Amino acid sequence: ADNLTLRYRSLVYQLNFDQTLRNVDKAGTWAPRELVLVVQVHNRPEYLRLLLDSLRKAQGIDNVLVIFSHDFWSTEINQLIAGVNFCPVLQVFFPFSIQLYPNEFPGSDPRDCPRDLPKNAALKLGCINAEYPDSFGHYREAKFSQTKHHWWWKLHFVWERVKILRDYAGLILFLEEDHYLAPDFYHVFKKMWKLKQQECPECDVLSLGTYSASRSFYGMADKVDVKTWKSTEHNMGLALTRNAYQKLIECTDTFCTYDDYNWDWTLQYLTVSCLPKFWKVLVPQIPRIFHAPSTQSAQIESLLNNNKQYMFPETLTISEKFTVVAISPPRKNGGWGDIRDHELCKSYRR
Numbered sequence: 001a002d003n004l005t006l007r008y009r010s011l012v013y014q015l016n017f018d019q020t021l022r023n024v025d026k027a028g029t030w031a032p033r034e035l036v037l038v039v040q041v042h043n044r045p046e047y048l049r050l051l052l053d054s055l056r057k058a059q060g061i062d063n064v065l066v067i068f069s070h071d072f073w074s075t076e077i078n079q080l081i082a083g084v085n086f087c088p089v090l091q092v093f094f095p096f097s098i099q100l101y102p103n104e105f106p107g108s109d110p111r112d113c114p115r116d117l118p119k120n121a122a123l124k125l126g127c128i129n130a131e132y133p134d135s136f137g138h139y140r141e142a143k144f145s146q147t148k149h150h151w152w153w154k155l156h157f158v159w160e161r162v163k164i165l166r167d168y169a170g171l172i173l174f175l176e177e178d179h180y181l182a183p184d185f186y187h188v189f190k191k192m193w194k195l196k197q198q199e200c201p202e203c204d205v206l207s208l209g210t211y212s213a214s215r216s217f218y219g220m221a222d223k224v225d226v227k228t229w230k231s232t233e234h235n236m237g238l239a240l241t242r243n244a245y246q247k248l249i250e251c252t253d254t255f256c257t258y259d260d261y262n263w264d265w266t267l268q269y270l271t272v273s274c275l276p277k278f279w280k281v282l283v284p285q286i287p288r289i290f291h292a293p294s295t296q297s298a299q300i301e302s303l304l305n306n307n308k309q310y311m312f313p314e315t316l317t318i319s320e321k322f323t324v325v326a327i328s329p330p331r332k333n334g335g336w337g338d339i340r341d342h343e344l345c346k347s348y349r350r
């Protein structure tokens, strides 16, 4: 196996097996505790760089394992992550990416149906997926399937295949290359988790914040709310317990067959149609994560620097408890009718 794609497949298989942990003396007593970060990484190094900047400036994370999950191999991306010398780092690699399979499924096989070919013409052509369009009559485009595959694959991989997380008793926080973390996020996370155990038994997940940030943190920087988890508000910096993970992975067949190419809309469907109880989320009133890039980077940093006096709250408080009602997705977005995507997505659990 000599050409470039096969070299990348060999590296991926070996590195996922070896799981080289950077910046820890494996002879010592270190083990991941309380919080692990998992970052979904595609191919936007300029955004990954901002995220790495925010982790470098974050307080108290010298011992927090950060796992980077890649579906694109590049020297630029690997070199950005190799420069991280300040916390434990693991890189893992999605083994079914378009980069590794360019001209066959889950990339683009020449025998695949064109996106808009009508069904009768598709059947007459005999193209591979002619009997399996999505709900709107459209046939698969590989690039819109990859994000959902990667997300489910790495969910299972970090909770079940990462050796250093064997018998891990903390939470795992899922974020992306184009997020930016507030410097007190770990401080706030630990108090949120304690408040969850004291006051929100029915909460299954934690969020580091929604997309709405107030200009002044006054009166709100120490407050957290209990809410129905809503994909459009709480998909950024989502922290899972082992219990939420176990319930999710038992919903593999539903997640992998539901006809929506968005991982987070599919999760919304699981909350009303597969999970034993719909998700309630504990979430701060002031976000500790932001969505990103120089201008947009300084815009994040200016907001944080105006509110220095409010960061690192000494105690967090839950706001008034209201009835919360489960939320279903208002429609299916399609893009996920191809039975090969269903089958591959389901195989990750094995």
Ligand SMILES: *[C@@H]1O[C@H](CO)[C@@H](O)[C@H](O)[C@H]1NC(C)=O
Pocket: 003, 004, 005, 006, 102, 103
């Ligand atoms: C490398 O070879 C494999 C099969 O031998 C093929 O699927 C792949 O597209 C090739 N890629 C390049 C860049 O040559």
Ligand code: IUM
Pocket: 045, 046, 047, 049, 076, 080
């Ligand atoms: O953005 U450049 O390394």
Ligand code: IUM
Pocket: 176, 178
């Ligand atoms: O890929 U971003 O949200």
Ligand SMILES: [Cl-]
Pocket: 178
């Ligand atoms: Cl985006």
